């Protein structure tokens, strides 16, 4: 061989995992969809 004209390295080719975006109704996520109903039935209940 001669001297190198390029330096290598063995590594792993693999797909990037798809970063599904936090879509525009993202702020409803910190409570469960039945709890948002339970709050809504509370403010419809306690007001009655």
Ligand X SMILES: *[C@@H]1O[C@H](CO)[C@@H](O[C@@H]2O[C@H](CO)[C@@H](O[C@@H]3O[C@H](CO[C@H]4O[C@H](CO)[C@@H](O)[C@H](O)[C@@H]4O[C@@H]4O[C@H](CO)[C@@H](O[C@@H]5O[C@H](CO)[C@H](O)[C@H](O)[C@H]5O)[C@H](O)[C@H]4NC(C)=O)[C@@H](O)[C@H](O[C@H]4O[C@H](CO)[C@@H](O)[C@H](O)[C@@H]4O)[C@@H]3O)[C@H](O)[C@H]2NC(C)=O)[C@H](O)[C@H]1NC(C)=O
Contact residues for another protein, defined by CB under 8 A: 32, 34-35, 38, 42, 46
38 near ligand CLR (CB under 6 A): yes
41, containing H or E segment: helix 35-45
Q: Tell whether the torsion through CA atoms of 31, 36, 42 and 43 is positive or negative.
A: positive
The entry of ligand X, ligand CLR, another protein, none that residue 35 binds, CB within 5 to 8 Å by partner kind: another protein
41 near ligand POV (CB under 6 A): yes
Q: Torsion-angle region of residue 37: left (phi > 0), alpha (psi -120 to 50) or beta?
A: alpha
The residues that touch ligand POV, with contacts defined as CB under 6 A, are 20-21, 23, 25-26, 28, 33, 36-37, 39-41, 43-45
């Amino acid at each position: 061989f001669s001297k190198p004209f390029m330096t290598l390295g063995i590594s792993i080719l693999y797909r990037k995992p798809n970063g599904t975006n936090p879509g525009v109704f993202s702020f409803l996520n910190p409570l469960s969809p039945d709890i948002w109903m339970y709050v809504l039935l509370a403010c419809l209940g306690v007001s009655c």
